Amino acid sequence: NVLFVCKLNPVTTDEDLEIIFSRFGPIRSCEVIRDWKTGESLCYAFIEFEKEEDCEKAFFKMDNVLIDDRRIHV
Amino acid sequence: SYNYVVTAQKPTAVNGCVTGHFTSAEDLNLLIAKNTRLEIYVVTAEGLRPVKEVGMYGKIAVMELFRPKGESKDLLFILTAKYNACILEYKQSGESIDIITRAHGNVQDRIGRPSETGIIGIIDPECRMIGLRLYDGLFKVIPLDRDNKELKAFNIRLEELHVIDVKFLYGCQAPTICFVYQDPQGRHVKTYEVSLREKEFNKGPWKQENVEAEASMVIAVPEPFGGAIIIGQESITYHNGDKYLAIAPPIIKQSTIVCHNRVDPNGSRYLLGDMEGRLFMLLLEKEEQMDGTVTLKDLRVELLGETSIAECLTYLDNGVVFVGSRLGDSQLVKLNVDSNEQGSYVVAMETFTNLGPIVDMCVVDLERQGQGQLVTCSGAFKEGSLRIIRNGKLHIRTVPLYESPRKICYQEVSQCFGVLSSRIEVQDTSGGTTALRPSASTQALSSSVSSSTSFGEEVEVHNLLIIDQHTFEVLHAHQFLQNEYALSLVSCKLGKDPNTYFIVGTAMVYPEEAEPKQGRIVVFQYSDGKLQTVAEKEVKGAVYSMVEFNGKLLASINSTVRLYEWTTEKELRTECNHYNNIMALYLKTKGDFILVGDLMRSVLLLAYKPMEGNFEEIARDFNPNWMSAVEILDDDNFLGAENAFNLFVCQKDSAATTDEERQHLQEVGLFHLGEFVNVFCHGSLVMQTPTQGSVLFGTVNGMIGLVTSLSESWYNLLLDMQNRLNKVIKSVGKIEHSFWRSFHTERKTEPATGFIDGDLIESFLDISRPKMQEVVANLQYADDLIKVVEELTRIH
Amino acid sequence: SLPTSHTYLEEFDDDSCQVIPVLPQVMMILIPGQTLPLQLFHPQEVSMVRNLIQKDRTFAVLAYSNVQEREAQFGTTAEIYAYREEQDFGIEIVKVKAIGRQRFKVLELRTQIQQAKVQILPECVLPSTMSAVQLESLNKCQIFPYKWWQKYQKRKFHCANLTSWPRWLYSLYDAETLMDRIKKQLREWDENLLPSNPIDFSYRVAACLPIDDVLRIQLLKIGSAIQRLRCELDIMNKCTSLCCKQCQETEITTKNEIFSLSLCGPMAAYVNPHGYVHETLTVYKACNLNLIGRPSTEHSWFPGYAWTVAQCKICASHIGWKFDMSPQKFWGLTRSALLPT
Ligand SMILES: COc1cscc1-c1cn([C@H]2CCC(=O)NC2=O)nn1
Ligand SMILES: [Zn+2]
C-alpha cells in the first residue's frame, strides 16, 4: 500500500506532500530521499498509505499531479 | 667527536658580592662571584688583597652570609643555578687554606616551573631559617639547625603568584617575611609570619597596603628604625606599623634603581645605583628621638656621582665603595666629603677588568706572524670598549669607545679594524636628536653621514668606526640612515678586485612593526684616509649574518639565504637563492658546506654545487631549544651553544646508507658549560699533537674558552682519568662533577657525553704526589700522565 | 555561546608508545582543543565505544594525508566527554562528543576496527628567551601591570645588549608579542573582541584559519608553541580567499566575512543525523552560491536559525548552507569544498 513518486519540487517538504496526498486517503508514513552527505532532497519520495485503498486512490488521482508548481510522477 | 674544553680566560663579570667577617673574626672580607669562581679578598686600607679564588661546580645565583649563635666567623650560603645548596666555612691551618662544606644538598622540587622573577634567597636576621623563592606559588624554607646536616627543606604555600620582591624584617618576635607582589588590582606589600613548628604561615604585623605601580625593591631597615622601605621608579616609601612616609624626588625619575646596600650598621644611610650609573644616597631622618623610639621624618635623596653601571654595590670600611659592574670595568671608588671637585663626591680609586660581555671576537696576528692576538668588542652602553688580549698570564689592554660596540673585523691592506657601534641620543624639541655623551662615534678625525616620534624617547644611532691597529685612535666614523640598525660586518675581498672591502648589512626597524620589511647592504672601500662608500644595494628584509664564500658574498636576507657575485662594476649581483622555513641568523661556511641556524636550534647543512649553480640541502636537525652561537669544527662535526648554558656537538653520519639516516644529525656529545657562549671564532693564542683544530669562544660573563679535538685513544684515556680524579678531588660544596656537567634544560637532563672537562684534567698537575698514586693504579698508560697533562696545558 | 553545546544531538605520557583504537569513517584532522562530534551505526563501532566509555573513553583519529586512501603518518587522540547510545529503530546508534587532547606519530596500523601502534609526541614549553642571560638585579622589572608595547620591549628585553642580537629580534620569539599580533590580525577581519596560555591559543588559531589539510598536518608536527605561533603568523599573511575545490576557478568567499558566531571560533565541526562530519566555517556573506530547497529548523546546529542547501553556481558542489535577531543572515561552509588560494 506504498507508492513511490519522483520528479518532485526541491522546496517541497514532507508535511506538505503528506497533506496533499491526504486527498488520496490516510497515510501511515511518508519520506523523501536526500543526499546523505549534503541534506538536499533527491526528488524521490515513498509514501506508505494506511491501506492498499489509500495507495490505489493516490495512484488513480495523482497521475500528472501538479504539486508545488511541479509535476509528480508515481 | 670526542672534543676537549678548557677555560682560557676565567670569567670576570661580577654577578654579586658580599661584605662580612668570613676569613677571620677581625678581618673584613669582600666575596665576589663571577659565574662559578668565588674570589675572597681582604679589605685593606691600600685596597684589596686577593687571598683565595675557589672554583665551584655550579653558577652562584644566591650568595649570603649568616652567623648562627655559638660560632666565630660568618658562614657562606651559596645556591647554584641547578639548585645545589651548600654552606661553606673558611678554615686555614698554617699555609693551608681550605673550604669545608658544613651542609650540602639539591633543593629542586620534582614538579614546578621556575619563577619568572628568578631565584630569590634570603636569611633571617636572627639566623633561624633560610628562605628561598625558587618556584612560583611556593616558599622553600630550610630550617638552619645544627642537626640538619643535609639541608632538609620543606615547602609552604603562598596565596599570591607574582611575588616581585621579598625580604625579612628586623626586630620581630617571630620571623617575618615582607614582600611586594602583583595582582590584577595593583601592587601590594604584605607581611607573613613563618611558624616553623607548625610549618605554616600566620598573620603578619602590618597588613596589605597599596604601593606605587612600579615598586621594585624592598629594603629591610634594621633596628632601632625598623620596618621596610619600598623603592619604586617614581616614589620612595617607608612602612612600619602605623608610620607611613613617602617622597618622589625629581632626581630618580630619569633612571630606575636596580641595586642597594647598607652603609651604616644602624641603617640611617643607604646607597642606590641606577641603570645609567648615578649613585644616589638615601638618608633617613633619625632626629625623631622622642622616648627611646626613633621614627622617620624625611627621606632626602642626594646625588653623589656617576659611577660604572652597578650590578652590585658594597660599602667597604672608611669611605670606600666597591661598584661591581657586570657590563663594564668594576671600580673601587671613594666618597670624599671634602673633595667635591665637580659637585660629584665620587673620585675613582682603582679599576678591575671585566672583559665581558663579549659580543664579537677576532683573532689577528698583529705582530710578524707570531701569536694570534684577540680583539674583542666588550661592554655595552657607556662602558663599551675594544679589548686586545695577548698571551705573552694574559695581557689585556683597553680602547674605550664610550659607546656600545657590536662587531669587529680586521683589514690587513688597510691596517684597520672595522667596528659597528651604537649610541643612545635623546629627541630634542627641534625634532632631532642630541647626544648624551661625547661618544667615540662623534670624536673621529674625519666623519661622514650616510646619504641615500615623541619627546624624551631614546633613539639609537648606529655607526661604523675605522680604528687604527697601532694607536687605537678612531680614524673614521660613518653614521647610518635614521632608524637603521647595522647587523653584520665582514672584511673580505671579492672576486677579482684586488682591494679588500668592508661590507655591512643593515635593517631598518620602526617601533610600530615587528619584522623589518626593508634592509640594505653597503660595500665600503677604505683608502686615502677616507671611508668611501663604493656600492649599496637594497634587499627586502633584514640582513643578520654575512660571510664570504669561494669569492662570493653570502647573506641572510630574512629567511632567504642568498649568494652575491662581485661583478667588474663593483656591484653586488644575485646568483642563486635559497628559501628556508627558518630565519638564517647564523651562517658558517667551510669549504663547500654552509651551516645555517636560528634561535630555535634549527640546524641546516646546505651545500654548494658549482656544476649546476644552486645550493642543495644535505642534513637537517630540529629540536626546540635556544641556540646562542653555532660553529663548524671539522668537515663533519658542528659545535653549538644552546639553552641553559649548554654545549652540543652534532655529527653527520657519513657511514649511513639510508636516506633517513643521511638527512639527519646524530647528536654525539653534550656538556653543561655554565656560561652563555656568545661568539665562536677560529684561532689559537699559542705559537704554531694530541689536539687538532682549535675553536675559541667568548661568553657574557667574560671568560674565553677553547674547544679542540682529541683522538680516540686519547679520549678514552682522558675519560678514564676524569672518572679516576672525581674520586679523590673533594670539590667545594660536595657537588658531584657528573651532575654539574650533566646537560640541563628545564625539561630534561642527560649525563655528559663527548666532551672532556679540561679543567678537571688540568687540575691533575696541582694535586699532591701521594694522591696521584691512587688516581691511576690500573691503567698501564705515573710520570707519563704528567707528560699528558702538561702537553695539553701547552695548548692555551 | 549556544552553538558549542550541540544541543541538536550522558556526562563523561611523553614519548610513550601506546596502541589505540581508531574509528573508521572519521577523516577530520583534529587539533587538540577542537571538539569533534561523531555518529556511529555499525555494531562494531557501538561495542567499541561502549567498552571505551567503560575503560578510558579514548580513541585516535588519524591526520590522513589522504583520508580516502587511509595513508597517514600522524594523528590526534580524543577523550570522550559525552556520548549517547540510542538503538531505536532496531539499529544501534551512538552519537558522541569528544575533544582532541593529545597528538601522536604513527608507527604502524594493524587492521582487524583497527589498532594503531603510535607514540605520544610531547609538548615543549621553551622558557623565557631572556632567562638564559637574565641579570639578577634587573629581574625585578620583569613584573608589570604602540606606547605600551614599546615599553614592553624596553623592559622585558633589557638584556639584549648583553647578547649579540637586538631587542626587536627577540620580539619575534616572545610568546606574548606573537599572541597579540595574532589578535590584531584576527580583529582585522571581525569585530569580536582566545585563551592566554600560548599552547591553547596557538592550537585554536591554527584551527580557525581557513587553510588546507596539508598545512594543518604541518602545524600539528611542531611541538613547541612559539614555532607554531610563528608559523601561524606566516599563514595568516597568506590566505586571502576561499574557492570551491570542485570549481578551482571561482572564488567562494573572502576573509572579510569571517565572524565568530560560536565561541569555538569561525569554524568548528558538526555531525548531521546520518553522521558524515562536516567542518563548517561561518561568514557574513557568500559569493557565487545558489540555494536549493527551503529553510527548515530540522536538526539545525545553531539554536534558533534554519538551513537551506547551498552550492556553487558552476559545478553545483555542496558548499554549505545559508542560515528580529542579530545577525539576520550568514553562511556556513563545509571545509571539504573550501580550497585556500
Ligand atoms: C542525511 O542528510 C539529511 C537528511 S534529512 C537532513 C539531512 C542533513 C542535515 N544536514 C545539516 C544541515 C545543517 C545543520 O544545522 N544540521 C545538519 O544536520 N546535512 N544533511
Ligand atoms: Zn564549485
Q: The domain spanning residue C281 has which CATH number? A: 2.170.150.20
| Residues in chain B after which the backbone breaks (C–N beyond 2.5 Å) | 392, 452, 688, 781
Q: Do the chains contact at C292 and A40, CB–CB below 8 Å? A: yes
Q: Tell me: do C189 and C98 sit in the same domain.
A: no
Cell (9 digits) for B542: 633584514
**Which residues on chain C are in Cβ contact (under 8 Å) with B700?**
133, 162-163
Strand partners, B597: B586, B603
Q: What is the CATH number of domain B710-796?
A: 1.10.150.910
CB neighbour burial string for B653-684, b if at least 16 within 10 angstroms, e if fewer: beeeeeeeeebbbebbbbbbbbbbbbbbbebb
Distance of CA B742 to the CA centre of its chain: 21
CA distances in angstroms from B98 to B51, B54, B672, B731, listed in the order given:
12, 9, 26, 11
Q: Using alpha carbons only, how large is chain A's radius of gyration in Å?
A: 12
Q: Check: CB of residue B325 under 8 Å from CB of residue B14.
A: yes
Helices (H), B11-84: none
Q: Do the chains contact at B256 and C136, CB–CB below 8 Å? A: no
Question: Is C247 annotated as a binding-site member?
Answer: yes
Experimental method, per PDB record: cryo-EM
Q: Do the chains contact at C142 and B217, CB–CB below 8 Å? A: no
Distance separating alpha carbons of residues B16 and B324, to the nearest angstrom: 7
Q: Check: CB of residue A53 under 8 Å from CB of residue A23.
A: no
Q: Does CATH place domain B14-354 in 3.40.50.300?
A: no
Q: Do the chains contact at A36 and C309, CB–CB below 8 Å? A: no
Domains in chain A: boundaries: 2-72
Identify whether C301 is part of a domain. Answer: yes
CA–centroid distance, residue C312 to ligand 2 (Å): 5
Q: How many residues does chain A have?
A: 74
- DSSP per-residue string spanning B740-779: HTS-B-SS-B---BSEEEHHHHHGGGGS-HHHHHHHSSS-
Q: How many residues does chain B have?
A: 796
Distance separating alpha carbons of residues B705 and C107, to the nearest angstrom: 43
Q: Report resolution in angstroms.
A: 3.5
Number of other CB atoms surrounding residue B350 within 10 Å = 15
Q: Using alpha carbons only, how large is chain B's radius of gyration in Å?
A: 28
Burial class (CB in 10 A: 0-12, 13-18, 19+), B787: exposed
CA distances in angstroms from B263 to B117, B315, B318, B319, listed in the order given:
27, 6, 10, 9
**Residue C272 in contact with ligand 1 by CB distance below 6 A:** yes
Nearest CA in chain C to B511: C150
AA letter at B779: L
Taking every pair of Cα atoms in chain C, the longest distance, rounded to a whole number of angstroms, is 74
Cell (9 digits) for B371: 701569536
- Interface A:C, Cβ pairs < 8 A: 25
Helices (H), C22-146: 43-55
**HSE-up of residue C254 (Cα within 13 Å, Cβ side):** 6
Distance separating alpha carbons of residues B159 and B201, to the nearest angstrom: 10
Residue A61 makes CB contacts below 8 A (sequence gap 6+) with A23, A24
Where are the extended beta strands (E) located within B471-613? 474-479, 484-492, 501-508, 519-527, 530-539, 548-549, 552-557, 560-566, 572-578, 586-590, 593-597, 603-609
Q: Check: CB of residue B604 under 8 Å from CB of residue B591.
A: no
**Which residues on chain A are in Cβ contact (under 8 Å) with C321?**
39
Strand partners, B280: B272, B303
Which residue's C-alpha cell is 707570531? B370
CA–centroid distance, residue C319 to ligand 2 (Å): 7
Q: Tell me: do C227 and C260 sit in the same domain.
A: no
Cell (9 digits) for B484: 637603521
Q: Do the chains contact at C172 and B515, CB–CB below 8 Å? A: yes
Where are the extended beta strands (E) located within chain C? 17-21, 35-40, 58-66, 71-86, 93-111, 114-120, 241-244, 251-254, 267-271, 277-283, 289-296, 307-312, 318-322, 331-334, 338-340
AA letter at B113: R
Q: Do the chains contact at A40 and C296, CB–CB below 8 Å? A: no
**Residue A40 in contact with ligand 1 by CB distance below 6 A:** no
Q: Check: CB of residue C252 under 8 Å from CB of residue C242.
A: yes
Q: Check: CB of residue C92 under 8 Å from CB of residue C46.
A: yes
Distance separating alpha carbons of residues C92 and C94, to the nearest angstrom: 7
Torsion of CA B720, B723, B724, B725, to 10 degrees: 120
Q: Tell me: do C256 and C334 sit in the same domain.
A: yes
**Residue C262 in contact with ligand 1 by CB distance below 6 A:** no
CA distances in angstroms from B623 to B436, B639, B791, C122, C223, listed in the order given:
44, 15, 37, 12, 9
Identify whether C12 is part of a domain. Answer: no
**Which residues on chain B are in Cβ contact (under 8 Å) with C140?**
117, 164-165, 216-217, 258
- DSSP per-residue string spanning B181-234: EEETTEEEEEEEEEETTTTEEEE-SS--EE--TT--EEEE--TTT-SEEEE-SS
Q: Using alpha carbons only, how large is chain C's radius of gyration in Å?
A: 22
Distance separating alpha carbons of residues C300 and C51, to the nearest angstrom: 30
* Residue with CA closest to ligand 1 atom 11: C272
* Residue C172 contacts B where some CB pair is shorter than 8 Å: yes
Q: Check: CB of residue B298 under 8 Å from CB of residue B306.
A: no
**Residue C301 in contact with ligand 1 by CB distance below 6 A:** yes
Q: How many residues does chain C have?
A: 341
Burial class (CB in 10 A: 0-12, 13-18, 19+), B430: exposed
B474-479 vs B447-449, strand pairing mode: parallel
Cell (9 digits) for B682: 677560529
Q: Check: CB of residue B91 under 8 Å from CB of residue B732.
A: no
Nearest CA in chain C to A42: C293
CA–centroid distance, residue C299 to ligand 1 (Å): 7
Burial class (CB in 10 A: 0-12, 13-18, 19+), A15: exposed
Which residue's C-alpha cell is 644535505? B618
Q: Tell me: do C276 and C190 sit in the same domain.
A: no
Q: Of C96, C120, C144, which residue is a domain's last?
A: C120
Strand partners, B257: B274
How many domains would you assign to chain C? 3
Identify whether C136 is part of a domain. Answer: no
Q: Tell me: do C291 and C230 sit in the same domain.
A: no
C-alpha angle C296/C301/C307, rounded to 5°? 30
**Which residues on chain B are in Cβ contact (under 8 Å) with C173?**
599-600
Choose from A40, A42, A68 for mutation: most chain C CBs within 10 A.
A40
Q: Tell me: do C215 and C252 sit in the same domain.
A: no
Q: Do the chains contact at C168 and B514, CB–CB below 8 Å? A: yes
Q: Check: CB of residue B1 under 8 Å from CB of residue B668.
A: yes
**Residue A70 in contact with ligand 1 by CB distance below 6 A:** no
C-alpha angle C287/C292/C296, rounded to 5°? 105
Nearest CB to A38 within list C294, C296, C318: C318
Cell (9 digits) for C88: 531505536
**HSE-up of residue C129 (Cα within 13 Å, Cβ side):** 30
Identify whether C134 is part of a domain. Answer: no
Percentages of chain B per state (helix, strand, coil), in multiples of 5: 5, 50, 45
Q: Of C174, C209, C239, which residue is a domain's last?
A: C239
Q: Check: CB of residue B194 under 8 Å from CB of residue B212.
A: no
Distance in Å from the first CA to the final CA of chain C = 31
CA distances in angstroms from C161 to B318, B357, B708, C165, listed in the order given:
35, 9, 29, 7
Residue B502 makes CB contacts below 8 A (sequence gap 6+) with B409, B411, B418, B464, B489, B490, B491, B523, B524, B525, B526
Q: Check: CB of residue B298 under 8 Å from CB of residue B238.
A: no
Cell (9 digits) for C191: 569585530
Nearest CA in chain A to C274: A36
What residues does the ion ligand 2 have nearby, CB within 5 Å?
C 244, 246-247, 312, 315, 317
| Residues in chain C after which the backbone breaks (C–N beyond 2.5 Å) | 9, 12, 112, 145, 193, 323
Where are the extended beta strands (E) located within B67-111? 75-80, 84-93, 96-106
Q: What is the CATH number of domain B1-13+355-391+394-709?
A: 2.130.10.10
**Residue C305 in contact with ligand 1 by CB distance below 6 A:** no
- Of the candidates B169, B77, B189, B175, which has an alpha carbon nearest to the alpha carbon of residue B129? B175
Identify whether C2 is part of a domain. Answer: no
Residue C171 makes CB contacts below 8 A (sequence gap 6+) with B514, C153, C157, C177
Please give the backbone phi and psi of residue C31, each rounded to the nearest 5 degrees, phi first: -115, 140
Distance separating alpha carbons of residues B230 and B189, to the nearest angstrom: 9
Taking every pair of Cα atoms in chain A, the longest distance, rounded to a whole number of angstroms, is 36
A2-72: CATH topology is: Alpha-Beta Plaits (3.30.70)
Number of other CB atoms surrounding residue B211 within 10 Å = 20
- Of the candidates B72, B70, B30, B69, which has an alpha carbon nearest to the alpha carbon of residue B53? B30
Domain assignment of residue C197, given as a range: 182-239
CB neighbour burial string for B519-542, b if at least 16 within 10 angstroms, e if fewer: bbbbbbbbeeeebebbbbeebebb
Interface partners of B (3+ CB pairs, < 8 Å)?
C
CATH number at residue C75: 2.30.130.40
Q: Do the chains contact at C318 and A35, CB–CB below 8 Å? A: yes
Q: Of C221, C239, C257, which residue is a domain's last?
A: C239
Q: How many H-runs (helices) and E-runs (strands) does chain A carry? A: 2, 5
- Of the candidates B270, B274, B273, which has an alpha carbon nearest to the alpha carbon of residue B282? B270
AA letter at C132: A
- Of the candidates C234, C239, C329, C249, which has an alpha carbon nearest to the alpha carbon of residue C286? C329
CA distances in angstroms from B736 to B82, B745, B768, listed in the order given:
12, 18, 21
Cell (9 digits) for C254: 573572502
Nearest CB to C274 within list A11, A36, A40: A36
Question: Which secondary-structure segment (H or E) carries A58?
Answer: helix A52-61
Q: Check: CB of residue C59 under 8 Å from CB of residue C83.
A: no
Distance separating alpha carbons of residues C228 and C220, to the nearest angstrom: 8
Q: Check: CB of residue B653 under 8 Å from CB of residue B605.
A: no
Question: Is C307 annotated as a binding-site member?
Answer: yes
Distance separating alpha carbons of residues C131 and B118, to the nearest angstrom: 8
Question: Is C165 annotated as a binding-site member?
Answer: no
Q: Check: CB of residue B134 under 8 Å from CB of residue B140.
A: yes
Distance of CA C19 to the CA centre of its chain: 24
- Interface B:C, Cβ pairs < 8 A: 118
CA–centroid distance, residue B44 to ligand 1 (Å): 90
